[PDB]
Amino acid sequence: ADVQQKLAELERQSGGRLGVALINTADNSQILYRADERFAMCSTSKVMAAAAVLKKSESEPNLLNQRVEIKKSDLVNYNPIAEKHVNGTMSLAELSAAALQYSDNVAMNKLIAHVGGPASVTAFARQLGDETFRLDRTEPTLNTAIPGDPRDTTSPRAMAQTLRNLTLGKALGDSQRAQLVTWMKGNTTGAASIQAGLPASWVVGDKTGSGGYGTTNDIAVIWPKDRAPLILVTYFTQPQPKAESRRDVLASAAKIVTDGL
Ligand SMILES: *[B@@]1([O])OC2=C(C([O])=O)[C]=[C][C]=C2[C][C]1[N]C(=O)[C]1[C][C][C][C][C]1
């Protein structure tokens, strides 16, 4: 109850809406705050798309080495890796890493397309028992994050449970799980978010997200020092369409829910 009040006060000062889901796998205890409300996933959805490709590769062993053409007309708003490979190709492995570790939007679009479109990424979540996740649009419009819009949303509880199944559970084959975890542990975008609220000695694999209405997200699997692993989802969105990102809010939330662990 103390943590709930701290998160409520953090939220008040932030001026936005905060969603938190922490799963402690030591005993399956949880800290939940607006955990059943819907939030625009933004780029945190790229974990689901990469996972669906990994699942597909479980029956197509050389799948991750297949080449995908990168076209100039594919470039959108944020293409840090794909812009370097225009007029060439990238493997699905490289596209998965680019989406997860640099939040490349072209890579996400290639991941979505390869599994049949957003409805197939959603079908994958259903296959995992996730009835809340829904992916409706491609990059970049899936990040609009309009209040009241259910497109491209999920709840902190649903994503925390699915991330547990993906990174610590049996959603993926163990070889594919290891690749997903390795990729997420190599993320370059998360130093100011969840990671920033945890001790430096803790190992973090995370995927961040940014969108309209100042939406600022992060989902992580965490191996604390001398503790069982944790799953943490911190979603944050704001009332103003042009609101600025608040990664500091996610760091504060992580510090609050891990205080005293
Ligand atoms: B995605 O949300 O991830 C992302 C991030 C991040 O990881 O927080 C940072 C910068 C760009 C991206 C690409 C994805 N978000 C968007 O494309 C979004 C950026 C702000 C305006 C609306 C589109």
Numbering used by the authors: 31 to 291
Verbatim from the authors:
However, their continued use is jeopardized by the increasing spread of resistance mechanisms, including that mediated by β-lactamases, which, cumulatively, can hydrolyze all classes of β-lactam antibiotics. β-Lactamases can be divided into four classes (Ambler classes A, B, C, and D) and manifest considerable sequence and structural diversity as well as different, but overlapping, substrate profiles. Of particular note are the CTX-M enzymes, which have become the most prevalent ESBLs worldwide.
Crystal structures of cyclic boronates 1 and 2 in complex with class B (BcII and VIM-2) and D (OXA-10) and PBP-5 from E. coli have been reported; however, structural information on inhibition of the clinically important class A β-lactamases, in particular ESBLs, by cyclic boronates has not been described. The overall structure of the CTX-M-15:cyclic boronate 1 complex is highly similar to that of the search model, with a root mean square deviation (RMSD) of 0.194 Å over Cα atoms. Aside from the covalent reaction with Ser73, cyclic boronate 1 is positioned to form hydrogen bonding interactions with the side chains of Lys76, Asn107, Ser133, Asn135, Thr238, and Ser240 as well as backbone atoms of Ser73 and Ser240 and two nearby water molecules, waters 4 (Wat4) and 116 (Wat116). Comparison of our structure with that of CTX-M-15 in complex with RPX-7009, a boron-based SBL inhibitor currently in phase III clinical trials, and a TEM-1:boronate complex reveals a striking similarity in the mode of binding for these related scaffolds. Against TEM-1 and CTX-M-15, cyclic boronates 1 and 2 show potencies similar to those of avibactam and BLI-489, with IC50s of low nanomolar to subnanomolar levels.
